[PDB]
């Protein structure tokens, strides 16, 4: 699965 | 053996004509398995490998949202990089991101990756310790200091040692009949006369996976690496790749030349001659 | 930095006249992203051509594969026409069924 930066 | 999982993303500004184009793909080794193009009607991540169509609606839903969010953040980063370099909003610029993980035969992580490029050159890269950044310029050092304030390396390391390796091993198990078979290369030697005293010997390697292949010509046991035209490995339209190596020899001395092919899918290195 | 694409025109399978095959044109190692690739049958562009999604190599250069289903014959001449910002004029690489 993909990762997503925090924000 | 060792296996790879990577995600590539590309954002390109389109001054005048509209929103940046965002296109991202996912690869397991040399097998593409997910895609996303912002220029679609309702853009959505789609399966490009048979073993990934198994995933349920929540999976594709979360992936679709992640890709739309990445497009938004890429617009943000494009504007910010415009103001970092004091560039003109009338010029088109490219942002390229890759991240992922390599695991070993035991499924244990060897290296995690996260790199970002601006206009085709390195911008900032997560070091191998998963704790530091390599910045290419002072603008990337601005970004580095802002990302150290936000522990982006810690988020990335939690993801790489955790979700990356787990889901890569999951994908591997799901389609092991394909991903874990090494397709050996069909090899042959062709002869094409170019003149009355010369002729090309071309060594082929059709039908192979993965892409990592070694083609070498040798003249009486001495490598002709400078007199050998060697083309880039290309896809064959399936998960299979192709590659050839040519050398021009005098007509009459073909048997002085020997091709040598090395692939993961071969038990022994092969040596070929024109017959 | 800008880089000029390497172009390859080739068939998916070994060419034999009268059999349905795939004609491919692989454009690799270029930057920036926007490229124009058409496939040509006797000078006219093929209308039903697909392409893979844009990914890039580890030096950040892009690669694409344009493909379409064709049927090689002895007389039909096939080519690939690639235009890039780095190019003086649209380049035309002819298909060599021995290559
Ligand atoms: N892909 C990137 N690193 N984009 C830059 C983001 C960090 C930037 N200093 C702000 O915003």
TrEMBL record, chain B:
Keywords for this protein: Disulfide bond, Glycoprotein, Immunity, Membrane, MHC I, Signal, Transmembrane, Transmembrane helix
Main subcellular location of this protein, as a coarse class: membrane
Positions of the Ig-like domain: 185-271
Membrane topology annotation: Single-pass membrane protein
UniProt keyword Membrane present: yes
Gene Ontology biological process terms from the UniProt entry: antigen processing and presentation of peptide antigen via MHC class I; immune response
Subcellular location(s) per record: Cell membrane
Gene Ontology CC: cell surface; early endosome membrane; ER to Golgi transport vesicle membrane; Golgi membrane; lumenal side of endoplasmic reticulum membrane; MHC class I protein complex; phagocytic vesicle membrane; recycling endosome membrane
S-S bridge residues: 101-164, 203-259
Family of the protein in this entry: Belongs to the MHC class I family.
Protein name according to UniProt: MHC class I antigen
Organism: Homo sapiens
Taxonomic path: Eukaryota, Metazoa, Chordata, Craniata, Vertebrata
Whole-protein coverage range: 25 to 299 of 362
């Amino acid at each position: 699965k993909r990762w997503i930066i925090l924000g | 053996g060792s296996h790879s999982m990577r995600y590539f993303h590309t954002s390109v500004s389109r001054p005048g004509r509209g929103e940046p184009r965002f296109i991202t793909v996912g690869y397991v080794d040399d097998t593409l398995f997910v895609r996303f193009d912002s220029d679609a009607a309702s853009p959505r991540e789609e399966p490009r490998a048979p073993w990934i169509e198994q995933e349920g609606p929540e999976y594709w839903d979360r992936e679709t949202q992640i890709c739309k969010a990445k497009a938004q953040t890429d617009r943000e980063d494009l504007r910010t990089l415009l103001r970092y370099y004091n560039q003109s909003e009338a010029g088109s610029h490219t942002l390229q991101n890759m991240y992922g993980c390599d695991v070993g035969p035991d499924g244990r992580l060897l290296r995690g990756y996260h790199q970002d490029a601006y206009d085709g050159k390195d911008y900032i890269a997560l070091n191998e310790d998963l704790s530091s950044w390599t910045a290419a310029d002072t603008a990337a050092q601005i970004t580095q200091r802002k990302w150290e304030a936000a522990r982006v390396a810690e988020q990335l390391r939690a993801y790489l040692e955790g979700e990356c390796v787990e889901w890569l091993r999951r994908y591997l198990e799901n389609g092991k009949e394909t991903l874990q078979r090494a397709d050996p290369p069909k090899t042959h030697v062709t002869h094409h006369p170019i003149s009355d005293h010369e002729a090309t010997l071309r060594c082929w390697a059709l039908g192979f996976y993965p892409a990592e292949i070694t083609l070498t010509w040798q003249r009486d046991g001495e490598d002709q690496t400078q007199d050998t035209e060697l083309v880039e490995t290309r896809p064959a339209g399936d998960r299979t790749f192709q590659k050839w190596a040519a050398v021009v020899v005098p007509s009459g001395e073909e048997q002085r030349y020997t091709c040598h092919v090395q692939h993961e899918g071969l038990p022994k290195p092969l040596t070929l001659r024109w017959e | 930095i800008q880089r000029t694409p390497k172009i390859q025109v080739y068939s998916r399978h070994p060419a034999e006249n009268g059999k349905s095959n795939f004609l491919n044109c692989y454009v690799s190692g270029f930057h920036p992203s926007d490229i124009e690739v058409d496939l040509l049958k006797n000078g006219e562009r093929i209308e039903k051509v697909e392409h893979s999604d844009l990914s890039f190599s580890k030096d950040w250069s892009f690669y694409l594969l344009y493909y379409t289903e064709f049927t090689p014959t002895e007389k039909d001449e096939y080519a690939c026409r690639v235009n890039h910002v780095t190019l003086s004029q649209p380049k035309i690489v002819k298909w060599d069924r021995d290559m």
